[PDB]
């Protein structure tokens, strides 16, 4: 069950490539 | 979260613009 | 530059690994 | 910042956790 | 989930290394 | 199509190749 | 010569992240 | 050449959208 | 089977910035 | 192996440390 | 060293591709 | 070693095969 987790690596990049210099919060859970 | 919305299904650009500072 | 924002690319997929559950904000310029 | 420590010199697994949350 | 979606990235990793100076198409349709 | 032959069985390095330009 | 091909990977996934439904082509001497 | 434009400077998505089908 | 071979990506992705300068060995036939 | 055990369930980094050479 | 440190990163996913089931060794330098 | 063949100019798949177990 590491679908998830190999996932968010996948959105990380995709959130780096949208926001840019802006930077972005990458929080998974809390 | 992130996870739960973005990977149970595709997000488009304007979804995942909610996450940027 | 081309040269630091693909080392950045790189940056985000190191703290997804190392910070797990507790997540990150990126910022760029401090 | 993160850029100006880790892209300049390769930053360990160490000093990267510090910019964890 | 989104494992074609996710499989589809990881496919346009391997055809830049394999095609090289050619290049390549990447159609998703159907 | 790539995603139908190569999301459920590994494609070689030479089946990838039929897609190049 | 190497700086333009790790650069040319990078590309191609912003490439799939932006065009999605439609694909691309993906051509560097063209 | 999309190499030329972007591995030089960087390329904003809508710039890179120009090179969609 | 693809999702083992999509996993294993992600694997040396992490056993390259965990082992640094020691280096690794990828044997999946095990 | 490291697939039937880092595929199957996340391994940390301390499980991973032990692949290294 | 950072530049090289990024190509790594590049060369070790081109060999998972390439090397399939063999599985290979990555030894920056012994 | 590998970093200085393949960091320095680019290695073709061939020559990358070089160093499969
Ligand atoms: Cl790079
Ligand atoms: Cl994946
Ligand atoms: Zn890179
Ligand atoms: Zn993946």
């Known amino acids: ?30 | 979260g992130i996870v739960e919305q973005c990977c149970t299904s595709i997000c488009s650009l304007y979804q995942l613009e909610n996450y940027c500072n």
């Open chain 1, 1 to 30: 069950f590491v679908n998830q987790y190999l996932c968010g690596s996948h959105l990380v990049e995709a959130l780096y490539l949208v926001c840019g210099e802006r930077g972005f919060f990458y929080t998974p859970k809390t």
